[PDB]
Design a protein around this ligand. Structure first.
Ligand SMILES: Nc1nc2c(ncn2[C@@H]2O[C@H](COP(=O)(O)OP(=O)(O)NP(=O)(O)O)[C@@H](O)[C@H]2O)c(=O)[nH]1
Ligand SMILES: [Mg+2]
Length: 157
């Protein structure tokens, strides 16, 4: 079963690091601004095509490539950046202007720097009818769950 999932978020929230942890089982402390990557993985039988997008902000205009043919979305913000959490709301609105959406507050490992509480992202997700979780691209355990969830959620809907 072929399925296309688009990862969206503000820049530097860890979109690429999430996708790379999930697919290659590695985390890099480096940084490379994404133009567009695609990561293919077989999740057990679904052929998952992850479209890892360029970071976006409150003014950006999302192209058709992000809306058409998309079976599901992973919307990522960073728990250490409220600005990124504010942008993910805009990005959602632009999106609705129905698919499974999993909302991910990433970089939960960086606890001392947290700005956005779990209960806060959970409520936002609830307001959309989306599933919510937190993660760290540094933990394979935490990262797998995001992507197995969005697939289970597509098989659901
Ligand atoms: N501690 C920690 N660092 C993270 C986490 N996720 C990403 N990072 C780090 O944060 C930086 C941003 O990661 P990146 O994956 O490039 O984010 P992005 O959303 O893909 N950026 P862009 O929109 O520019 O493509 C990187 O230097 C990476 O090492 C995480 O969960 N925890
Ligand atoms: Mg990226």
């Amino acid at each position: 079963r072929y399925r296309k999932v688009v990862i969206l978020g503000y820049r530097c929230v860890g979109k690429t690091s999430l996708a790379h942890q999930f697919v290659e089982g590695e985390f890099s402390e480096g940084y490379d601004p994404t133009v567009e990557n695609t990561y293919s993985k077989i999740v057990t039988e679904f052929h998952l095509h992850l479209v890892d997008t360029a970071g976006q902000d409150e003014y950006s205009i999302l192209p058709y490539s992000f809306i058409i043919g998309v079976h599901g979305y992973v919307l990522v913000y960073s728990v250490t950046s409220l600005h990124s959490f504010q942008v993910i709301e805009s990005l959602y609105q632009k999106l609705h202007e129905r698919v499974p959406v999993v909302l991910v507050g990433n970089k939960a490992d960086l606890s001392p720097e947290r700005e956005v509480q779990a209960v806060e992202g959970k409520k936002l997700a609830e307001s959309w009818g989306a599933t919510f979780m937190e993660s760290s691209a540094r933990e394979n355990q935490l990262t797998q769950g995001i992507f197995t969830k969005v697939i289970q959620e597509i098989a659901r809907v």
